[PDB]
Design a protein around this ligand. Structure first.
Ligand SMILES: Cc1cc2nc3c(=O)[nH]c(=O)nc-3n(C[C@H](O)[C@H](O)[C@H](O)COP(=O)(O)O)c2cc1C
Ligand SMILES: CN(C)c1cccc(NS(=O)(=O)c2nnc(NC(=O)c3cccc(Br)c3)s2)c1
Ligand code: SF4
Length: 372
């Protein structure tokens, strides 16, 4: 009909997904994306379409060019209190709800942080239905959630081993177990939960990981398993569901939508070639998949931005130690990209980023992924 709109019906054979007390109409999460990539426009429109919109809680101090920070040094949010800004996260959630209303929303918060519990509690207070946490083994998420018993809790893992450990440790100390698990494979965007040399080993392809995680989940009552990393279209979704996943998490396709809150990607992705997608070191301590542009090119030229830890974004870096060793500050680079700086920004992508040709709307994307 040329153009399908929000008043238009659509038939799907995908089934609604229950995560804790929350139901989403389609078994699809839009993966959280920092810094400033999945905020109110992206996540609110995803949730409007009946998938899980996920607000990234990382680097919210950059929102609206540090509208909600108390102190700025060298155009950066000062310390973790301002880098993970409570007021900004509150405004981002409120603005997403103007679009999606009470439709469920997640908040994504990396475990490797100073202040993890504070940011989790902030996300709950901002109205998140679901907390999603990777980049670490999040054995204590219920510690910080106990005043918000409706919020569902979802660790991101990269092995069946981690599922077993997390369930044991949660069950023993909180008499609770996770509401779902996301298993993230090595074709994903952002940071990988694998050493570099394991990111190319067939052992660790997502289709091998999913059955193992689903099997481990059986002992604990068939906790829903969400497959993530390299899922591009409905064919890949169906493959993962047929392997026992209850749903999928997808990010790179949404990075290529109009509603993405980091507007640079709409310019950058249509030009992106596969040869310019690489795995680089990160001050977070896991490999990161990046676009060979911006600060990465400036480092090679010997023009790298100066490093001085202002935002104190992640504990493994030790206030700049690791940033200086790997050559860049991830907070500074991602914030610059959100602010539109093509020369010194840092840009991330899944392995599939080169397949983005046209920038489409979230509505059109969900229609593509769910029809039939
Ligand atoms: C640009 C970008 C930024 C990301 N940032 C985060 C992040 O901050 N936290 C996180 O848990 N995952 C992050 N991810 C991972 C995604 O949420 C998702 O799990 C993954 O990219 C899915 O693989 P796909 O991109 O091939 O669909 C990011 C991914 C991309 C592409
Ligand atoms: C150990 N372990 C389960 C583990 C390890 C690595 C990846 C995963 N998979 S993942 O949690 O989905 C993520 N992928 N990319 C991420 N990026 C960020 O957190 C981040 C993004 C932007 C700024 C900043 Br400062 C941090 S987090 C799991
Ligand atoms: S120097 Fe390290 S801890 Fe400080 S903001 Fe940059 S990457 Fe984060």
């Amino acid at each position: 009909m040329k153009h399908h709109h929000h008043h238009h019906h659509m038939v799907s054979t995908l089934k609604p997904l229950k995560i804790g007390k929350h139901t989403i109409k389609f078994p699809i999460f839009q993966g959280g994306m920092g810094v400033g990539i999945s905020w109110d426009e992206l996540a609110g429109n995803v949730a409007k379409e009946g998938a899980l919109g996920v607000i990234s809680a990382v680097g919210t101090g950059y929102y609206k060019n540090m509208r909600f920070v108390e102190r700025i040094v060298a155009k950066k949010p000062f310390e973790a209190l301002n880098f993970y800004s409570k007021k900004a996260l509150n405004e981002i959630f409120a603005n997403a709800r103007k679009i999606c209303g009470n439709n469920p929303l997640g908040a994504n918060i990396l475990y490797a942080i100073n202040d993890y519990g504070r940011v989790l509690r902030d996300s709950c207070e901002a109205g998140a239905n679901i907390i999603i946490t990777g980049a670490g083994l999040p054995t204590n998420m219920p510690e910080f959630a106990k005043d918000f018993s409706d919020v569902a809790l979802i660790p991101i893992i990269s092995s069946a081993k981690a599922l077993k450990i997390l369930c044991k440790r949660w069950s023993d100390r909180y008499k609770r177990i996770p509401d779902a698990f996301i298993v993230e494979g090595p074709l994903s965007g952002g940071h990988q939960g694998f050493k570099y040399e394991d990111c190319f080993k067939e052992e660790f392809r997502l289709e091998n990981l999913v059955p193992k995680v689903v099997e481990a989940s059986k002992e604990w009552g068939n906790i829903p398993i969400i497959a993530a990393g390299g899922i591009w279209d409905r064919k890949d979704i169906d493959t993962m569901l047929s392997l026992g996943a209850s749903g999928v998490q997808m990010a790179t396709r949404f990075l290529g939508t109009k509603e993405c809150d980091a507007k640079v990607y709409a310019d950058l992705l249509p030009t992106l070639k596969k040869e310019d997608i690489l795995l680089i070191k990160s001050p977070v301590g896991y490999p990161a998949r990046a676009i060979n542009t911006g600060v990465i090119k400036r480092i090679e030229e010997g023009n790298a931005p100066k490093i001085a830890c202002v935002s104190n974004c992640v504990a493994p870096c030790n206030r700049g130690e690791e940033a200086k060793k790997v050559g860049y500050c991830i907070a500074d680079g991602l914030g610059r990209s959100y602010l539109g700086n093509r020369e010194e920004g840092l840009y991330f992508t899944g392995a599939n980023g080169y397949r983005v040709d046209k920038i489409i709307s979230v509505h059109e994307l969900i229609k593509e992924l769910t029809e039939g």
